[PDB]
UniProtKB/Swiss-Prot annotation, chains A, B:
Keyword DNA repair: no
UniProt intramembrane annotation: 139-156
Gene assigned in the entry: XPR1
Result of altering R232C: In IBGC6; phosphate efflux is decreased; present at the plasma membrane
Included range, full protein: 228 to 619 of 696
GO annotation, biological process: cellular response to phosphate starvation; intracellular phosphate ion homeostasis; phosphate ion transmembrane transport; phosphate ion transport; response to virus
Protein name, UniProt field: Solute carrier family 53 member 1
Length: 392, 392
C-alpha cells in the first residue's frame, strides 16, 4: 500500500507540468520572432522529451504487469521486498517534466544574464545527470545505483554474461538512438561552431561553418547511430558462444546485423550523390532492397518468436496463441497492426537521420516520427513479458 | 483511507492553484500600470479569497479534530455513515481557488473578448451559488443539502430550535461579515454605479455620486454589518426563553449588542463629521469607551467559558486548565497571546469598514485586515469544541 503522500506528489507534479506546457505553447505561438533560426532548440530538447515520455509509459507498463497478475519480480530477479511501484515512476516523470518546461521557457524569454540564451540547456542536462549519479543514500537509494550498474554492464557487454535484464535494457536503448544522435549533435555544435566567448546566437546558415554538424564528412554519425545494434549483436553472439545453440542466436544476430548494411549503404549513397557520381541510382536500388529485407525479417522475428503468435496450434483462439492472459482481444489485433505500420516508419526515420536528404524537411520528419517507436516499444513490452512468463 | 484518486485530485488542484497564483503575481507586477485605479477589482475578489481561505482552514480543523481523538461526530450530531474527511474539503477549496485565479486573470489580461472585465465575477459567483444548490445526486449531495437545510434553520432561528451547529455557523458568519459587506457593495455598484452601456470597464471617476457605495446613505452600511450580531442576539434570546437560565444567556445579550452600539456610534460620528459639528469630538470619546467595552468584554467571554481557561483548579498547568488533551501547551500559549492582538484589530476593522473615513488609506487597511479574523476563528474552533467535548 503506497502512502498518500506519493499520490499527492503525483497530482501536484502532473498539474504543474500541465500548466507549464500550456503557458509554453502560448509563449511559443506569441513571443517567438520568426526570422531567427529555431531548429537547434528542438534538436536539443527532443532528447529530454523522448526520455520523459519513455519514463511515463514504463510506469504504465509496470502498473499493467502488476495488475495482470504476471509475477515479474522473480523473472526480473528483482528483490521481492524492495520493488518500485508505478507511483514513484510517475513522480520522477513529473519532476523531469517540470524542469524541462522551466528550462525551455527560460531559454525562450531570457530576461537578463551575461551569456544571452545559451546557458540553460547545459545546466539542465547537468541537473539530469547529477540526479542520475547522486551518491547519497536517498531518492530511491536502490534503483539509481542498480540502473547505473546495469548500464555499465551493458556498455562492457562482451565480457560479462548476458541475462534477461541485460538484453531487455539493451533493446530498450535500441529504440532511443535519437537520444545519442542529438547528444552528439549538441557536442559537435558546442565544440566547433559555437563561440562560448561570444554574444547573440543567431549565426546565419549561409556561413561556411554552418551545417558542419549536419554533414557526414567525418562519418561518425552513422556509427553513433548504430551503436545499439552493435551492442545487441555482440551480446547475442556471446550468448551463443556460451550456450552453443546455433538456431535462435544466429537468427537474432542476423536480424540485428541487417541494420549495419542499412546505414552503411545509406551513407555511401549519400556521399556518392553529393559527389555527383554518374551511377548514384544503383545504391538507391539496393537501398530499397535492404529496406524490404530488413523490415520483413524483423517483422517475422517480432510476431513469430517474441510473442509466439500465429501458431498452428491456435485452436479456438484464431489469430492468437492458444493460451492468453489479457482478456481484450481487440488490443492484441490493434497492437499487431500498429506494430506492422510503425516498423517501416522506424527505419524510415533511421534513413532520414543518417542520409541528410531534404535539409528543410528531414529535421521535421525526424522530429515527428521520433516519439512513435518509443510507444511501439511500450506496447511491445506487455506481450514480450507475458510470453516470457508463460514460457517460464 | 480514501481511494488514491482523492489524494491525486487534491495534489493536482493544489499544484494548478500554486502555478496560477504565481503567474498572476508576475503578470500583475509586469503588465499592470500604476496610474490606473485597481481598488474595485480587489474589493470584488476579496470575498472569494476569504471564502477559499475559510474552506482550507476548515479542512485543517477537521483533520486536527480527528487526529486529537475528540468525538466530534456525536457533538455535531451528524450521521456516522456519511462524513467528509479533510481531503474532500481540500479538493473543493482547490477547485474554487482555480476558478478564482482564472477569472481574475481573465479580467486582468482580456486578450480577445467582447466584454472586457465586467462579466467574469458575476459568472464565477453564479456558478458557485448554483454548485451550492444543485439538486442532483452528485458532487457531495448530502453535505450540500444538509448545509442548505441548516442554513434555512439558522435564518429562521426565532421560530426554530437552536442547536450546536446552528450557533457554530452563526459565529462563523459573524466573523465573515466582510463577504456580506462586499456583496452589498457589489450589488449597489452593479445596480447604480457602473456604466453598463459602455466599454473598457473601470475608468477614473471623480463625481460625488461616485462612491455612494463607499457612503453610508442612511443605514445601508451599519445594518449589513450587524446582521450577524442581530442573528446571534435573537438566537440567544430564544435560547434563554426556552431554557430559562439567567447568567450565560443574558450576558451573551450584551456580548452581541455591544457591537451594535459600536456600529451605531460609528454611523453617528461619520454623519457628524459630514456635518462638521463642534460637539463631534465628544462622540469620539465614548467611541473609545464603546470600543473598550466591546473587546475586553468579548475577551472575558472567550477565555473563561468557551475555552474555559483561568480555572481555579489550574494547578500545574499555568494559566490553563487541569485537563488538556493536546500534546503541547505551546499551542495554548500561542492562542492566548494571539487572541488579544487580533480581537482589538477585529473591532478596529469593524469600525473602519463602516465609518467611511480615511478614503485613500482606509480601504488598504480593510483589505489587509480582512484575512486574519478567519485565521482567528480557525484557532478558536479547536479549543471551543475541545472544551465542549470535555463538558460533555
Amino acid at each position: 500500500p503506497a502512502p498518500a503522500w506519493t499520490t499527492f506528489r503525483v497530482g501536484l507534479f502532473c498539474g504543474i507540468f500541465i500548466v507549464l506546457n500550456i503557458t509554453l505553447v502560448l509563449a511559443a505561438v506569441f513571443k517567438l520572432e520568426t526570422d531567427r533560426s529555431i531548429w537547434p532548440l528542438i534538436r536539443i530538447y527532443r532528447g529530454g522529451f523522448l526520455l520523459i515520455e519513455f519514463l511515463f509509459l514504463l510506469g504504465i507498463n509496470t502498473y499493467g504487469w502488476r495488475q495482470a497478475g504476471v509475477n515479474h519480480v522473480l523473472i526480473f530477479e528483482l528483490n521481492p521486498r524492495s520493488n518500485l511501484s508505478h507511483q514513484h515512476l510517475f513522480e520522477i516523470a513529473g519532476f523531469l517534466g517540470i524542469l524541462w518546461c522551466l528550462s525551455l521557457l527560460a531559454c525562450f524569454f531570457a530576461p537578463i544574464s551575461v551569456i544571452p540564451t545559451y546557458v540553460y540547456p547545459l545546466a539542465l542536462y547537468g541537473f539530469m545527470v547529477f540526479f542520475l549519479i547522486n551518491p547519497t543514500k536517498t531518492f530511491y537509494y536502490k534503483s539509481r545505483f542498480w540502473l547505473l550498474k546495469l548500464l555499465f554492464r551493458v556498455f562492457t557487454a562482451p565480457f560479462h554474461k548476458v541475462g534477461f535484464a541485460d538484453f531487455w535494457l539493451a533493446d530498450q536503448l535500441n529504440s532511443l538512438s535519437v537520444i545519442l544522435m542529438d547528444l552528439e549533435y549538441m557536442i559537435c555544435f558546442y565544440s566547433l561552431e559555437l563561440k562560448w566567448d561570444e554574444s547573440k546566437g543567431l549565426l546565419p546558415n549561409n556561413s561556411e561553418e554552418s551545417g558542419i554538424c549536419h554533414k557526414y564528412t567525418y562519418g561518425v554519425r552513422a556509427i553513433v547511430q548504430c551503436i545499439p545494434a552493435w551492442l545487441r549483436f555482440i551480446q547475442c553472439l556471446r550468448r551463443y558462444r556460451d550456450t552453443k545453440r546455433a538456431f535462435p542466436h544466429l537468427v537474432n544476430a542476423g536480424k540485428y546485423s541487417t541494420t549495419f548494411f542499412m546505414v552503411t549503404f545509406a551513407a555511401l549513397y549519400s556521399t556518392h550523390k553529393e559527389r555527383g557520381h554518374s551511377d548514384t541510382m544503383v545504391f538507391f536500388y539496393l537501398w530499397i532492397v535492404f529496406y524490404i529485407i530488413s523490415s520483413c525479417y524483423t517483422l517475422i522475428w517480432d510476431l513469430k518468436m517474441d510473442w509466439g503468435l500465429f501458431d498452428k496450434n491456435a485452436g479456438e483462439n484464431t489469430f492468437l496463441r492458444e493460451e492468453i492472459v489479457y482478456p481484450q482481444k481487440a488490443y492484441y489485433y490493434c497492437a499487431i497492426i500498429e506494430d506492422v505500420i510503425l516498423r517501416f516508419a522506424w527505419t524510415i526515420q533511421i534513413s532520414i537521420t543518417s542520409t541528410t536528404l531534404l535539409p528543410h524537411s528531414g529535421d521535421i520528419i525526424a522530429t515527428v516520427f521520433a516519439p512513435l517507436e518509443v510507444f511501439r516499444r511500450f506496447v511491445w513490452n506487455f506481450f514480450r513479458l507475458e510470453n516470457e512468463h508463460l514460457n517460464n
